[PDB]
Write a protein that binds this ligand. Structure first.
Ligand SMILES: [Ca+2]
Ligand SMILES: [Ca+2]
Ligand SMILES: [Ca+2]
Ligand SMILES: [Ca+2]
Ligand SMILES: [Xe]
Ligand SMILES: [Zn+2]
Length: 316
């Protein structure tokens, strides 16, 4: 909508207070004009027609329980926007400052979040398995990364390409989490998963096998479920990324870690300059090697580390 840029305040899903960029025009809207062509958050009002209505608030204070998922959706979209711009010189998900829209309160007890080709959608969770999914900055950035992927490599959401696609989103979801620097880890969804159980999460990049996901190519899932295991076989690429960053010895193969920032630069370049819609794991390894080569030189530690990491997860 047209109006004047303001700053509201409220509370997120985990009860933390934050300021949010809003727009004033009779009501204060969850519309952030400070980033590209706007960040827009909507109320789906427990139904599934999207996007729903642009979030409207009478006094620019967002402390109602009902407000909390909207607050975090809008805020964490801004953080994610900030990461890609500041760290990779990318302007929103299409690279040309496309408007970022999100809808919260989608359906009833909906234990998921997703990118629907045009926008972010967040369930509220059933309160058992999940609380409103926008509470997790890694979940928000995972999903927005899918948009980035869809506009760049275009990895098909099936079999190995799909698994890479999932990994990329877990990878950048995690790097945005570190970027924001609130309790960062190499786990996924821990902030909003199983409110009754502490110390768990949806997936682990540091040890995928903690939840039955493969950490080695010889352990890959080959059935047809989950689009050919896109959230399952991602663990193999997740572990590779973890090792490039953090180092370690995995099934006997030692990797020299090179840190999160170089991890991000290598995988961002692979994503935007080398991967294609039908890339497989073996082509991801080659893309990552070439990317590290472009960035640091063929005799670099960085290249050497990439080779060890894929070696360690049995990807040649
Ligand atoms: Ca209010
Ligand atoms: Ca965390
Ligand atoms: Ca996490
Ligand atoms: Ca939990
Ligand atoms: Xe983005
Ligand atoms: Zn995903």
């Amino acid at each position: 909508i047209t109006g004047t840029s303001t700053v509201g305040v409220g509370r997120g899903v985990l009860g933390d207070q934050k300021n949010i960029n809003t727009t004033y025009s009779t009501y204060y809207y969850l519309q952030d004009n400070t980033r590209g062509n706007g960040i827009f958050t909507y109320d789906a009002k427990y139904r599934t027609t999207l996007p729903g209505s642009l979030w409207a608030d009478a006094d620019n204070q967002f402390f109602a329980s009902y407000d909390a998922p909207a607050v975090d959706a809008h805020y964490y979209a801004g953080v994610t926007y900030d990461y890609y711009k500041n760290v990779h010189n990318r302007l929103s998900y299409d690279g040309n400052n496309a408007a970022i829209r999100s809808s919260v309160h989608y359906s009833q007890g909906y234990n998921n979040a997703f990118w629907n080709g045009s926008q972010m959608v967040y369930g509220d969770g059933d309160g058992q398995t999940f609380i409103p999914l926008s509470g997790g900055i890694d979940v928000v950035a995972h999903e927005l990364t899918h948009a980035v992927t869809d506009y760049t490599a275009g990895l098909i959401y099936q079999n190995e390409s799909g698994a890479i696609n999932e990994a990329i989103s877990d990878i950048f979801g995690t790097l945005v989490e570190f970027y924001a620097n609130k309790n960062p880890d190499w786990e996924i969804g821990e902030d909003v998963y199983t409110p009754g159980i502490s110390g768990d999460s949806l997936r682990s990049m540091s040890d995928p096998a903690k939840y039955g996901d493969p950490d080695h190519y010889s352990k890959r899932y080959t059935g047809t479920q989950d689009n050919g295991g896109v959230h399952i076989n991602s663990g193999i690429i997740n572990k590779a990324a973890y090792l490039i960053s953090q180092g370690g010895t995995h099934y006997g193969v030692s990797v020299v870690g090179i840190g999160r920032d170089k991890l991000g630069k290598i995988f961002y370049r692979a994503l935007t300059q080398y991967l294609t819609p039908t890339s497989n794991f073996s082509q991801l390894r080659a893309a990552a090697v070439q990317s590290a080569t472009d960035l640091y030189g063929s005799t670099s530690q960085e290249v050497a580390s990439v080779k060890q990491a894929f070696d360690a997860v049995g990807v040649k």
